[PDB]
Amino acid sequence: RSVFSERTEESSAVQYFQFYGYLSQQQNMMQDYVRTGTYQRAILQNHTDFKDKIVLDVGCGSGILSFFAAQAGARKIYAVEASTMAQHAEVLVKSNNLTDRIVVIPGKVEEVSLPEQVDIIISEPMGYMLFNERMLESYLHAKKYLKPSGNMFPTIGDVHLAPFTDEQLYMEQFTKANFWYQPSFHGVDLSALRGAAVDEYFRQPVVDTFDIRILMAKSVKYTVNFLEAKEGDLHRIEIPFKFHMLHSGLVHGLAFWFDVAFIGSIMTVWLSTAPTEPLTHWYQVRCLFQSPLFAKAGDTLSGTCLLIANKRQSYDISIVAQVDQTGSKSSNLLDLKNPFFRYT
Amino acid sequence: SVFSERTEESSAVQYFQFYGYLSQQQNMMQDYVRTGTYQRAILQNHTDFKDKIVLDVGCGSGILSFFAAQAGARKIYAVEASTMAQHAEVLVKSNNLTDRIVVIPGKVEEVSLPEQVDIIISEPMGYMLFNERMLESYLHAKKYLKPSGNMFPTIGDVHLAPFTDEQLYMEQFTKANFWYQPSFHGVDLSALRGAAVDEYFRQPVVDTFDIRILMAKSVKYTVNFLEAKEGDLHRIEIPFKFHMLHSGLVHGLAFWFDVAFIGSIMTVWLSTAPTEPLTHWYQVRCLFQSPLFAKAGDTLSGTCLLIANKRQSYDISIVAQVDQTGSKSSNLLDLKNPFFRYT
Amino acid sequence: APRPPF
Amino acid sequence: APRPPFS
Ligand SMILES: Nc1ncnc2c1ncn2[C@@H]1O[C@H](C[C@@H](N)CC[C@H](N)C(=O)O)[C@@H](O)[C@H]1O
Ligand SMILES: Nc1ncnc2c1ncn2[C@@H]1O[C@H](C[C@@H](N)CC[C@H](N)C(=O)O)[C@@H](O)[C@H]1O
Structure with a gap:
């Protein structure tokens, strides 16, 4: 029909x-x-x-x-x-x-x-x-x-992704979910739903901004050229990555931002939503790993971010990553339609 | 179904x-x-x-x-x-x-x-x-x-009372007046001035406030759940007559509600009033796009009308007049699109 | 949001 | 909300 x-x-x-x-x-x-x-x-x-x-x-x-x-x-x-x-x-x-x-x-x-x-x-x-x-x-x-x-x-759009460490962001998910870890909330044991509450919070991408110091390697980018691209190309978006870790710590997830370029006859002008740039109504977005990964500067964090378009005008996000030197692995599923707007 | x-x-x-x-x-x-x-x-x-x-x-x-x-x-x-x-x-x-x-x-x-x-x-x-x-x-x-x-x-009481809150009024008014700009990046927005005011003042304001802002004793509309039929709620008509206790500008009506559990042993009330400790329901204020001037001793009378819609909510109209001057305010409110103002 | 966050 | 609030 349409x-x-x-x-x-x-x-x-x-x-x-x-x-x-x-x-x-x-x-x-x-x-x-x-x-x-x-x-x-x-x-x-x-x-x-x-x-x-x-x-x-x-x-x-x-x-x-x-x-x-x-x-x-x-x-x-x-x-x-x-x-x-x-x-x-x-x-x-x-x-x-x-x-x-x-x-x-x-x-x-x-x-x-x-x-x-x-x-x-x-x-x-x-x-x-x-x-x-x-x-x-x-x-x-x-x-x-x-x-x-x-x-x-x-004319074109670049998505950037980069790993981050933010221990407090990570712990907040558990402090929130632990509402359910009580044996007698008005006489009711809620404990059995604690795991389901954690899963729910971790499925939400986090919209807010952050100090660039949390980023642990230079970003990788995935580019869409709007002159060439077909609608069908955005149904399944696979973004491979191999981060070369600039810093050692616990990797708690990936951070996402984007730029677009207006490529004109006279000049190219850029609109950037990067964390290094003044803030926009797009902020930035962070996808947590429910199990974080330890990496030391010099290691490689490799994996794939896969966005699968859905009928609710959004994507099902799947992020899988590992530290190549150790083999420790983390898998995550997020619903981009239901972000947590964390910003004040 | x-x-x-x-x-x-x-x-x-x-x-x-x-x-x-x-x-x-x-x-x-x-x-x-x-x-x-x-x-x-x-x-x-x-x-x-x-x-x-x-x-x-x-x-x-x-x-x-x-x-x-x-x-x-x-x-x-x-x-x-x-x-x-x-x-x-x-x-x-x-x-x-x-x-x-x-x-x-x-x-x-x-x-x-x-x-x-x-x-x-x-x-x-x-x-x-x-x-x-x-x-x-x-x-x-x-x-x-x-x-x-x-x-x-067992029962539900809805309370309403007129309020004064010029800070609230201006906050909402200022947002609307974005659309009064004759040269927003060189563009004249000003023809949507009135549409913008209409849209902002259609939004009921959900937060709390001090009882000192209330200008008269509250009017009460009761629904008895033991006796009401579903269809009673399709069109809810709440008339009111406020005996104004203070002079000043009436910026709109504030609403809250109580429910009573009428047991065989005792009645227990759950109140969301602004005189009580705060609940997740807060309170609700319907602003008038132009406030009404009243004097202590005047009467503010009219009707609040709630028309059930298919978006699981209500089209609300509040017509209020200050009897002593014939000054009136008619308002339409889209109860599905509230402004959650609470810090 | 039917219910406002407390 | 598709677009986050901003000020
Ligand atoms: N027509 C309906 N049939 C069944 N459940 C409904 C209907 N309308 C709303 N609900 C549910 O009613 C609940 C309303 C909640 N305010 C109350 C939850 C719970 N009884 C409590 O007090 O904590 C929600 O979980 C809705 O999903
Ligand atoms: N498939 C579509 N067809 C027509 N309009 C759409 C479609 N999808 C989204 N929109 C509209 O696109 C607008 C997107 C806004 N980001 C831009 C508004 C405006 N161009 C601005 O730059 O301020 C919204 O007003 C949507 O209602």
């Missing part, structure tokens, strides 16, 4: 689009200054990729990126938005007197019609850990509207 | 998912006032459980069913629709109560029980009492209730 509805449980989609229907949620993204400001810079400083061009904005939300394409001289911008935010975008197009130049199209990019092909697709479809929400697939799907040799902004 | 007919599958799926998490059961369990008061209610009324048949509506961990067992119940059917049912079963085994507690997975609207019960226990209260529409499931369960059977809780 590529979107095929890969998506209606229940997930309803919530998803209701969330984006809220002005406050659009506002939450807009106020991310690093995010919004870099998009603006990327577009305006590459004004020749936009001047008198035809543009598609995939998931326009408020319209903000389409207004930036207009500030850069675009002739015609089709702004597609699946949520009821489309109605609000439309109100802005009129009140900013850009009816001749921005056409808001309510609906899913997998289901609407465009009148013509475009020179360039712009989007902000990045979830935490890059891939969450599965909107990158919508963005790739949109290339069916892209004129041969058209461009995409952003 | 009666359930699926009033519930969007999309809402249901998310609802029971949330309660399937041990962390969320733990959140409620750890509310000592809530869990301890349910325990006192049940154990202090032991003769209402002693050698009786009990239904626990939405048993979660099993916690209330254990209290019913501690009080000597012969048999307890512990109904739960989330995956928490499997964890309840584990606890029933690990506590050697397989002979007395019988977990039944499913919605109480959809399961079958082998017999009628003497008493129904549940913890079905949402914030502002009615959120989640689980009171309707609890009343639905009376089909299993023996004639002259009891309900624990």
Whole structure:
């Protein structure tokens, strides 16, 4: 019926689009200054990729990126938005007197019609850990509207992963789960659920930020080129790694962040969510190992991170790792859809 | 089922998912006032459980069913629709109560029980009492209730009182006014000003506050669970007449609720009032997008109207007027989209 | 969130 | 919430 509805449980989609229907949620993204400001810079400083061009904005939300394409001289911008935010975008197009130049199209990019092909697709479809929400697939799907040799902004995306040590983060999981380790909570022995409580906490990726000192080796990266990639390429994402340990300690899990590059005619501009960069609404994400691993500087931490896309607009994450010198091993399964938002 | 007919599958799926998490059961369990008061209610009324048949509506961990067992119940059917049912079963085994507690997975609207019960226990209260529409499931369960059977809780009082809190008003107002900017990165947002205010003020505010902010004695609306039918809760109409005790700006209405367990031995109250120790229900405030000016001695009158929707919640309208000036405020609130403000 | 975190 | 709160 639709590529979107095929890969998506209606229940997930309803919530998803209701969330984006809220002005406050659009506002939450807009106020991310690093995010919004870099998009603006990327577009305006590459004004020749936009001047008198035809543009598609995939998931326009408020319209903000389409207004930036207009500030850069675009002739015609089709702004597609699946949520009821489309109605609000439309109100802005009129009140900013850009009816001749921005056409808001309510609906899913997998289901609407465009009148013509475009020179360039712009989007902000990045979830935490890059891939969450599965909107990158919508963005790739949109290339069916892209004129041969058209461009995409952003053009490529890099995921970085790196091992970390954070003993307190690790212990918090047990302190939380040990609520259940009591033989008489109002006369009830809860102990038998302690293991299930631990498993539940460890299945949640942790969204928050951290001092770079916790990282124990230089990151490995996995790159998606949005010009070349097919939707199908994001269904099963396998990220091998061989870390060369810069520091000795207990490895408690892997940390994830991402960068995107806008590769324009005039310049490449980068948007980075790295822990070395000022903070964004994406923070960073950490996947704990339920059994941590000891490594000494010079050892190799090798393994695989596998993300398997699911019908709830997220991924099932599987991380397997070992210290090559000792053979000690840790396996972990996480649900990217249900992160723990730890940050204050 | 009666359930699926009033519930969007999309809402249901998310609802029971949330309660399937041990962390969320733990959140409620750890509310000592809530869990301890349910325990006192049940154990202090032991003769209402002693050698009786009990239904626990939405048993979660099993916690209330254990209290019913501690009080000597012969048999307890512990109904739960989330995956928490499997964890309840584990606890029933690990506590050697397989002979007395019988977990039944499913919605109480959809399961079958082998017999009628003497008493129904549940913890079905949402914030502002009615959120989640689980009171309707609890009343639905009376089909299993023996004639002259009891309900624990037995009654529910919702309290409302007008408040003044200009800091709250401005906090919400300031967020809305993001959309008053005529040149956000060169873009004029200002045409969505009114839509933004509407959306922010649609959000009920969940947190606590000092009783000094209340401007009149509270109005009380009661629901008797022993007597109410499910359909009574589809459209809830609460009229009010406040005799204003202080002059100043009325920023909205504050809501809280009490429940009473009317036992054969004693009545035990569980209150979420702001004069009492805090619970995980906190309190709820519905802000007016424009406050009403009142003088001590004036009357503030109108109606709060709760219309059940298929997202397991309520469309709320509060029309309030200061009789002495004809100054009015009409408001619509989306009880499903609250703002959790508490530090 | 049906129930607010305590 | 797909996107974390931010300020
Ligand atoms: N398949 C889809 N079709 C159309 N719109 C979508 C789709 N998936 C997500 N969206 C919308 O994409 C937007 C994603 C936001 N990150 C971006 C909003 C806006 N472009 C901004 O940069 O501020 C949300 O408003 C979603 O409702
Ligand atoms: N229609 C329904 N049928 C069965 N269980 C339900 C229904 N609606 C809500 N629930 C469950 O009722 C529980 C509500 C909890 N507030 C109470 C848990 C437990 N009785 C306690 O007091 O700790 C949740 O576990 C829900 O999954």
